């Protein structure tokens, strides 16, 4: 009965933790933010339609200069886009057709991709020759690569389908720190503005906060009730918004360590794929399976706009660093720039 | 850079992607003759993927195969214990939201091994499936030449049982094509080509809404 005693102790600990959350749970963000005026209806138009992808664009990523856009599609082609002029800066063929993630380095020299091949392939965009080649091949994950982000030029963090997250060094080619503790397939992670810590959402309906240097699970958030597919920090860095398959978007505060506000509507029965925050963080954009995106207010949990025009499920979306525009990529092989 | 993409566009559309999924004992590799395989029949390329490098959680990476031409389902009839498990797997694939527009080609792999099992009499289907006792061989069904009548009834009961889930849901968007395969068979590639050709023909008719 040793196992039974351990489970009872964990259950008691959860009740004590839950009581701790309720002790400081006085008032709500919705109650506090009732006095401020609503942002109002937001009108968004497709300034640029990026065409050329053969298959569905499962993942996309923005550049730090708010000009270069990288998108990964199942046709086996990785394309770097010039959003201002709608031109293909580069077209990188992929060894594996199935790619699920793509990352753009903050400096812009490196671009990464990963998918069902269980390998995070990284290409150098600033090579002397000018032709894109595999700069370094990362292997060691026993599950499909779902999300990868560039902490810097030499460090990359990847979330895989084997319920683990890893930190990889480009020069060494091996995982320096492995983040273990998730009980479900990790689908997405976000990087804090200071890159000191990051949170990864898995298919276990929980988001765990990790610190890159220490490699330990600082905090765990359990507010959702279905598979988590979208993770994004607030611009302040002290909070993050999480979208799941239960058609609800929930905002969590790192210091409060509890659920702040839920962005759900009765008519919505479609899960969340990608979420993002605007420059100020007041505007929340979430992807949906109903062939369109919805614009939410981070302080009032009301719908402010609808991003229609997509002929399939919105797989991914992203907002530029300066907040100039938001790009949405769906399964219709089309990328749309909204402003 | 646009010229290279145009050349790749023709190659991408010319080839047909297929997904090979099934039980480990079903003999997925036998159907063909790293995990990726390519076979060309009648001057058209057929490209098939067997995903075995992932875990048992298949509710997330299965969404990457919503654009394939068809799903090749391989099931073994020699094990009645795992036959129910395969039926649940087929039901999940058939009723999947992202796979509702993809036809499924069902292979009753290693039908030769099923012959000895039903003739021996040690293992009875009725123990696992009570409906087998009341089941009767359909008139439209054609018994295999040189085969016992019980062999035909046993193998068609499994095929019919798989087809009940197929007819239960789908609304005509996707169709199931059941085939019987022995231990060795060189007609597997031809059968896949015929069904894939049929799937494309029905897709255009549905697109024209004649179907």
């Amino acid at each position, epitope marked *: 009965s040793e196992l039974d005693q351990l489970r009872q102790e964990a259950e008691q600990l959860k009740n004590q933790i839950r009581d701790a959350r309720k002790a400081c749970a006085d008032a709500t963000l919705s109650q506090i933010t009732n006095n401020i005026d609503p942002v109002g209806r937001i009108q968004m138009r497709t300034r640029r339609t990026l065409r050329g992808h053969l298959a569905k664009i499962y993942a996309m990523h923005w550049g730090t200069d708010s000009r270069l856009l990288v998108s990964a599609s199942q046709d086996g082609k990785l394309i770097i886009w010039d959003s201002y002029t709608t031109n293909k800066v580069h077209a990188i063929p992929l060894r594996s057709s199935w790619v699920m993630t793509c990352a753009y380095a903050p400096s812009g020299n490196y671009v990464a991709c990963g998918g069902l091949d269980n390998i995070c392939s990284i290409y150098n965009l600033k090579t002397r020759e000018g032709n894109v080649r595999v700069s370094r091949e990362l292997a060691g994950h026993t599950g499909y690569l779902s999300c990868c982000r560039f902490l810097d030029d030499n460090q990359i963090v990847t979330s895989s389908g084997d319920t683990t997250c890893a930190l990889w060094d480009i020069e060494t080619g091996q995982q320096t720190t492995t983040f273990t503790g998730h009980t*479900g397939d990790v689908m997405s992670l976000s990087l804090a503005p200071d890159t000191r810590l990051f949170v990864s959402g898995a298919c276990d309906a929980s988001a765990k906060l990790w610190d890159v240097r220490e490699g330990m699970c600082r905090q765990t958030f359990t507010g959702h*009730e279905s598979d988590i597919n979208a993770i994004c920090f607030f611009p302040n860095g002290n909070a993050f918004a999480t979208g799941s*398959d239960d058609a609800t978007c929930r905002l969590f505060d790192l210091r409060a360590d509890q659920e702040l506000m839920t962005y759900s509507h009765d008519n919505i029965i479609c899960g969340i794929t990608s979420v993002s925050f605007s420059k100020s963080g007041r505007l929340l954009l979430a992807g949906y399976d109903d062939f369109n995106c919805n614009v939410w207010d981070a302080l009032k949990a009301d719908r402010a706009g609808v991003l229609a025009g997509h002929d399939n499920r919105v797989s991914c979306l992203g907002v530029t660093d300066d907040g100039m525009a938001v790009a949405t990529g769906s399964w219709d092989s089309f990328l749309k720039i909204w402003n | 850079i646009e010229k290279q993409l145009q050349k790749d566009k023709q190659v991408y559309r010319a080839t047909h992607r297929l997904l090979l999924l099934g039980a480990d004992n079903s003999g997925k590799s036998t159907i063909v003759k790293i995990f990726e395989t390519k076979f060309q029949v009648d001057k058209v390329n057929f490209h098939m993927f067997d995903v075995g490098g992932q875990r048992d959680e298949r*509710r997330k990476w299965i969404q990457c195969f919503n654009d394939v031409t068809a799903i090749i389902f391989v099931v073994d009839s020699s094990d009645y214990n795992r036959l*129910q498990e395969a039926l*649940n797997d087929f039901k999940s694939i058939w009723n999947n939201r992202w796979l509702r527009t993809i036809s499924v080609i069902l292979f009753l792999n290693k039908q030769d091994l099923l012959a000895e099992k039903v003739l021996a009499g040690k293992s009875k289907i009725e123990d*696992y499936f009570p409906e087998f006792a009341r089941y009767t061989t359909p008139e439209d069904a054609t018994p295999e030449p040189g085969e016992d009548p019980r062999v035909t009834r046993a193998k068609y009961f499994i095929r019919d049982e798989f087809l009940r889930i197929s007819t239960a*849901s789908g609304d005509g968007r996707h169709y199931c094509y059941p085939h019987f395969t022995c231990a060795v068979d060189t007609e597997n590639a031809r059968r896949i080509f015929n069904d894939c050709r049929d799937i494309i023909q029905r897709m255009h008719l549905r697109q024209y809404e004649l179907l």
Partner: nanobody
Amino acid sequence: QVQLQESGGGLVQPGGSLRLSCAASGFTFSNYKMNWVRQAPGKGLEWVSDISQSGASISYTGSVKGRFTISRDNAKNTLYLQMNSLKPEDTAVYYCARCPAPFTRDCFDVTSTTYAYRGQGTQVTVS
């Protein structure tokens, strides 16, 4: 937090009656299709029966067809399974499982040892 608790179980004489109760918390019980799965000793997990969101679509596996009666109680977020005519083969650990995606009739609860939406379960022994 999603947590499923199973009550009942225990040793039962063959041919007896058992009513397992599954407690659901942290989610709306009415919005998810619910399943019961058992894991025989030395064997992998297998699906037993499922209930639709409104209970209209209920199906059972071939081994408990007619023998087992299942139902859901949306008033207090409870799932009930009735077992009759116990046999030695039925001796297994029964788990209460929930399909992940709401408003869907498809799920992959047959997954073994890696599923956050499956409860701890209860041990059922048939003499």
